[PDB]
């Protein structure tokens, strides 16, 4: 799976169909995966770097792969 | 949904019915949605500023969108 | 539902029924809600100050409410 | 039930059969409880006392209560 | 269990299948346990040392044993 995006956690959102959504780089991308809510809000309270991998790479787009830096 | 509400987590509480309520800015509100218990409770630990989306925007309204800052 | 006890987390405990167990100022409780578990136990590493809303106030009483400050 | 060991957790173990193995002071000890399983982990990694209760308090015997401090 | 490996996690992967990829030292290991994704991802995050252990030490191999030193 390419990268889309990579950088710093500029905020994340719990959504009503109980998805949750990052903003990182230029991009608002969500996941349906529940663990990795923690693990993202954990990335943006401490400041960490992460790279988005998805086929779905634009606004709206849905992943399942992240790397935390 | 609108911005209901923006600021620091001040406090939460876990109810009886299983809902959980913050009360950010002047305004309690509480969610059904399980996930967001563990996220709140870390905003508020950690300091985050939450902007709560709802239109029942008055004490004891509910919520399911949040955006955590 | 009136307070019991604030105060931190002196020490949690898990029961052989599946319970959990919290001594706050000088009242050990217990809840049945699988969910205040997690919760507790982070109030506890964290240092969080807590109310415990029950009418059973007395050692050895249940309670299902909390507020987490 | 007794006392039988308290410290820190030194490490955890997933064994084949599905329960969860701690070691705590010069023992290990068993459970296989699922909801222990998470709690442990937390109690390791942010370096917290416990107090395990079990009246079958050498290598290899197993758990349901824990006390944390 | 032998060890594998030992150092720092240099970063952590949350993979496609839910399953959670570290890289410490020179191997890539992945483990299925959902439980220790945030603890790895606090290892990281606070620059512990971690001593994985496996008997599938190579890259794309599995692990459930942990240390945190
Ligand atoms: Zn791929
Ligand atoms: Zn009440
Ligand atoms: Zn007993």
């Not at 086929?55 to 992943?63: L, P």
Request: glycine letters at 8%; a negative charge; proline letters at 1%.
């Amino acid at each position: 799976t390419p990268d889309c995006v990579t950088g710093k956690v500029e905020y994340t959102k719990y959504n009503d169909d109980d998805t949750f959504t990052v903003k990182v780089g230029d991009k608002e991308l969500f996941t349906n995966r529940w663990n990795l809510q923690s693990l993202l809000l954990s990335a943006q309270i401490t400041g960490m770097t992460v790279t988005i991998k998805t086929n779905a790479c634009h606004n709206g787009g849905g992943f399942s792969e992240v790397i935390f830096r």
